[PDB]
Amino acid sequence: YNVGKAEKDGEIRLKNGVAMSKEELTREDKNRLRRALKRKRSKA
Amino acid sequence: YQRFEQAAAFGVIASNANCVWIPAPGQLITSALEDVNIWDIKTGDLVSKLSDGLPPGASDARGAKPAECTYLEAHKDTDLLAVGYADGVIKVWDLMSKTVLLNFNGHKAAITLLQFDGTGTRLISGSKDSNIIVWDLVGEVGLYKLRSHKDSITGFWCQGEDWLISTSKDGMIKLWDLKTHQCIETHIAHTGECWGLAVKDDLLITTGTDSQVKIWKLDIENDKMGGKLTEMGIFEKQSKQRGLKIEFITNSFFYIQNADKTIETFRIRYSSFILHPFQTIRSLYKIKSASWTTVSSSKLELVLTTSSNTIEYYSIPYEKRDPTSPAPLKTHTIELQGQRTDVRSIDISDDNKLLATASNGSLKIWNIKTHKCIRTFECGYALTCKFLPGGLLVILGTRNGELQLFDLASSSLLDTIEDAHDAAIWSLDLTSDGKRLVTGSADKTVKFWDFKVLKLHHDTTLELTDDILCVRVSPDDRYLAISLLDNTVKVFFLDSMKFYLSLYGHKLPVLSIDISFDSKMIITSSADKNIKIWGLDFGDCHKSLFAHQDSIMNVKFLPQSHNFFSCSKDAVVKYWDGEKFECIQKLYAHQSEVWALAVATDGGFVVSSSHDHSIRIWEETSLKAGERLMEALDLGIAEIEGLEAYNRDMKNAVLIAVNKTPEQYIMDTLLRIRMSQLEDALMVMPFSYVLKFLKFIDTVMQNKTLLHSHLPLICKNLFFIIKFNHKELVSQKNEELKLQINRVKTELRSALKSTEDDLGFNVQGLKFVKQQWNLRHNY
Amino acid sequence: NKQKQLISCGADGLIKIWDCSSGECLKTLDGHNNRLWALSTMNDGDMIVSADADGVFQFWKDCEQEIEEEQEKAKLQVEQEQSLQNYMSKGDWTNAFLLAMTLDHPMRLFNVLKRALGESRSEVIFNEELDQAISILNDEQLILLMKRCRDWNTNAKTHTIAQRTIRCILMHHNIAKLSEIPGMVKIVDAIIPYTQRHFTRVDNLVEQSYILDYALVEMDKLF
Structure with missing residues (x-):
């Protein structure tokens, strides 16, 4: 059992097991998550 | 090389903010562009205006349009007027x-609502971004920052120093406490946004988008959701337009100001x-804004300001049964210092008697020395103007095919040559003596007129293949330049119309x-965003100059030399030299499209009407890990032993700043440390700090919840520190250390056995579930 | 009858309706099978009647009650979001857990369980009303909770909460139920080996607690 990106688009699931809904977040948290996913995509 | 800045501002009556009314009717505060206008109502004269210390376009000026005053509110008892600008100051x-x-800055966009309790010497501000801030004046700082909406804050209300209610451009209403300091209640009011909100002591009235207004009740009932807010009544069919501002009045009325006049x-x-x-x-x-006034519940007196520079008053007598009047009473109107519509042409006399004409035909004569009007006339949609020096007369070319002339001394209509052209007449120039007029008009027609002593008579017309936009006659009266609909400037000899020269290469109409x-x-x-300088001796392009991001609306020379001024739609006036071909100065006075420009005939002041009714007279003159752990150890254990000595007697700035008990402080820097370090x-x-470490660990074993929060980190550090300093620790003799080690051992063993028991129960039960299901449903 | 959404019958056997000013088909109705011949509208109750070559017929009618239901759904969701935020502020972690299970917010759920364990650190596994809620939970609620506990068990720092919740589930649910719940065996098989890993690691830490005991014994022997 590995972990991957979760099934629902309303949730994000990182590789360390945590799961974050796209609704219970704050705006700056949404911003930093987008920035992290952006720099990961830019490296890939 | 000089420096010119502005010296006046006309037509600045009704900017984009809310009027604030003052009793003695009494005077009225409204917003000017980059200023605040106050005036009496029976007279309508500008009592005072408050601007900043730098005039625009000076040395200290910045390459940005200044933020306009978008809201304001004043306490008349304390006589303090707070003002909020477009950038969030x-x-x-x-x-x-x-x-x-004193000034504050905590927002990022325009400031919508401002309210302040001078009795609380505090000021609540909700701007176009999501945060509501509360500043305090005698403390001169932001006490906190309330933020749970997402779009803006459009409706806003406060109760004492205890409660708040706020609604936004996403239609949800949030009841906020002030003690518990958080959003408590939200209810989605309307489907779309929720513009307007007005709170009486029992009911609150909230309007949305399609004349849907709602009437709810407030209470301090202690349920989680009930009591504090209801969904009591819904009223409709007030208008078809969205409501904008609701305000209550009682000596038993209120009013809803919409956006449909x-x-x-x-x-x-x-x-x-x-x-x-x-x-x-x-x-x-x-209309834009309104405020009420009433006395003895026998009359209703309202002050209103519109989008155009009109300040209207209203009065209705009544008897608490009947409004008594089919229409209100406009006992005060204030217009004359404004233009009432967007200006389209400006001219300057040799006397420097300024001339401004607009969409009304409302030609208004101004002057520099008095900054007020002389007289107005009206002729319809007038486009271009001209000052005639002989007699100091004025001429207007319109969008209707008609050409008018007014006088500064006698009445408006001395002559009005109508049916002059089929389509609109766009530009108009005059020979330097004043004898021949020439008009360029959208019939592709260049009509030349003589000045008969008075009347005008077209001595000829010229027919072109393309529509016409601009016409300019030489100051030496030799050439006549026509800018067509295509990228064409034809230059004619004035004496015989010889089609002398042509200029091309703009890709857009000149x-x-x-x-x-x-x-x-x-x-x-x-409109190609570059100015082209040509030599007319050979029709050659001396230079091109890209500037003025939107479109260079108008260019004017100086009568002394080749130094010109360019004004655009993107609100910047650039002053260039035509021999060095570099912008000397870059003025950022106003913010809308700089429609009309006029330079002084001799002086150097320039006037520049914007779209927002702006007349501008420009006149010239780090530790390491180990170390940080050690010092945090010192601080926390010093506090701990001081507490212990104080407890036996009963028998830090960083600590009280971060608000952590010292055990949690030390555990936080242990969390902050990295393993590889x-x-x-x-x-x-x-070993002194080792013994201090063991004392801290015993304190955590007393404070069990932190232990079960961070069991593996504590155990790893403790086992490594005792394995390292094992020899001296067993060489020492300390009975208090013996008891400390005994307590630490018992509590660590108990906690680890507890979590081991949980893990074992879980793995046995799940193995049984897997075995039972496999023996059941596997073939 | 609304005179905006013009409707079209169709010989494929179906109806498609569109806003007249749009130019794009709004909705698609596929009741009839083979063909479609007769199509009429009633105005006062805007009811579309349809007939095909077969002897089968149907009536159709728009409803704004779905719009009302969606507005009520959004209103309810926002209401209980605020109730959850207030409970996360003050306490009543049983109610906070109920709202979190309805709302599917695993971060706030994890924080609720962390606070519950920390305050239940003083049989009893949690707050007793929280235990009753876990006993009450639905089967789909159990599947969702066990998936989240599977991930929290994957992470080595959340395994305590994972094991406590799983032990509470086993103590307050039928093992017959947990065997007959579909798709749970994959979750349990995923859960088990990580639990064994954490078990061996905790055993090692107990051994080093006995190392502490040795240090005490030798110090007393010298003393």
């Missing part, structure tokens, strides 16, 4: 001394049971021509 003026004294005053005595539509008030302009005093340089401006950082410290 909150200034505040006194009215007796007439100066700003209408306010509706209602009376309170299901929606038909409670409410009572008292009457309507209708104006001919799109919107302005100017030629030099000695008639060698022709400067041309199109934790090895060396634990090996470094001496």
Whole structure:
């Protein structure tokens, strides 16, 4: 059992097991998550 | 090389903010562009205006349009007027001394709502971004920052120093506490946004988008959701336009100001049971803001300001049963210092008697020395103007095919040559003596007129293949330049119309021509965002100059040399030299499209009407891990032993700043440490700090919840520190250390056995579940 | 009858309706099978009647009650979001857990369980009403909770909460139920080996607690 990106688009699931809904977040948290996913995509 | 800045500002009556009314009717505060206007109502004269210390376009000026005043509110008892600008700065003026004294900046966009309790000496501000801030004045700081909405804050209300209610451009209403300091209640009010909100002590009235207004009740009932807010009544059909501002009045009425040139005053005595539509008030302009005033409940007196520079007043006598009047009473109108519509042409006399004409035909004569009007005339949609020096007369070319002339001394209509052209006449120039007029008109026609002594008579017309935009006659009266609909500037000899020369290469229609005093340089401006300077001796392009991001609207020369001015739609006036071809100065006065430009005939002041009714007279003159652990150890354990000595007697700034008990402080820096440095950082410290570490660990074993929060980190550090300093620790002799180690051992063993028991129960039960299901449903 | 959404019958056997000013088909109705011949509208109750070559017929009618239901759904969701935020502020972690299970917010759920364990650190596994809620939970609620506990068990720092919740589930649910719940065996098989890993690691830490015991014994022997 590995972990991957979760099934629902309303949730994000990182590789360390945590799961974050796209609704219970704050705006700056949404911003930093987008920035992290952006720099990961830019490296890939 | 000089420096010119502005010296006046006309037509600045009604900017984009809310009027604030003052009793003695009494005077009225409204917003000017980059300023605040105050005036009496029986007279209508500008009492005072409060601007900043730098005039725009100076040395200290910045390459950005200044933020306009978008909201303001004043306390008349304390006489403090707070003002909020478009960038999110909150200034505040006194009215007796007439100066700003302290400023704040916590927002990022325009400031929508401002309210302040001078009895609480605090100021609540909700801007176009999501945060509501509360500043305090005698503390001169932001006490906190309330933020749970997402779009803006459009409706806003406060109760004492205890409660708040706020609604936004996403239609949810949030009841906020102030003690518990958080959003508690939200209810989605309307489907779309929720513009307007007005709170009486029992009911609150909230309007949305399609005349849907709602009437709810407030209470301090202690349920989680009930009591504090209800969904009691819904009233509709006030208008078809969205409501914008609701305000209550009682000596039993309120009013709703919409966006369809209408306010509706209602009376309170299901929606038909409670409410009572008292009457309507209708104006001919799109209204902006309003405030009430009443005495003895026998009359209703409202102050209104529109989108256009009109300040209207309203009065209705009544008897608490009947509005008594089919229409209100406009006992005060203030227009004359404004233009009432967007200006389209400006001219300057040799006397420097300024001339401004606009969409009304409302030609207004101004002057520099008095900054007021002389007289106005009206002729319809007038486009271009001209000052005639002989007699100092004025001529207007319109969008209707008609050409008019007015006089500064006698009445308006001395002559009006109508049916002059089929389509609109766009530009108009005059020979330097004043004998021949020439007009360029959208019939592709260049009509030349003589000045008969008075009347005008077209001595000829010229027919072109393309539509016409601009026409300019030489100051030496040699050439006549026509900017067509295509990228074409045809230059004719004036004496015989010989089609002398042609200029091409703009890719867009040329919107302005100017030629030099000695008639060698022709400067041309199109919507192509670059100005083209040409030599007319050979029709050659001396230069091109990209500037003015939107479109260079108008270019004017100086009568002394080749130095010109360019004004655009993107609100920047650039002053260039035509021999060095570099912008000397870059003025950022106003913010809308700089429609009309006019340079002084001799002086150097320039006037520049914007779209927002702006007339501008420009006149010239780090530790390491181990170390940080060691010092945090010192601070925390010093606090711990001091507490212990104080407890036996009963028998830090960083601590009280971060608000952590010292055990949690030490555990926080242990969390902050990194493992790959934790090895060396634990090996470094001496045995005194080792003994201090064990005392801290015993304190955590007392404070069990932190232990079960961070069991593996604590155990790893403890086992490594005792394995490292094992020899000296067993060499020492300390009975208190013996008891400390005994307690630490018992509690660590108990906690680890507990979590081991949980893990074992879980793995046995799940193995049984898997075995039972496999023996059951596997074939 | 609304005179905006013009309707079209169709010989494929179906109806498609569109806003007249749009130019794009709004909705698609596929009741009839083979063909479609007769199509009429009633105005006062805007009811579309349809007939095909077969002897089968149908009536159709728009409803704004779905719009009302969606507005009520959004209103309810926002209401209980605020109730959850207030409970996360003050306490009543049983109610906070109920709201979190309805709302599917695993971060706030994890924080609720962390606070519950920390305050239940003083049989009893949690707050007793929280235990009753876990006993009450639905089967789909159990599947969702066990998936989240599977991930929290994957992470080595959340395994304590994972094991406590799983032990509470086993103590307050039928093992017959947990065997007959579909798709749970994959979750349990995923859960088990990580639990064994954490078990061996905790055993090692107990051994080093006995190392502490040795240090005490030797110090007393010298003393």
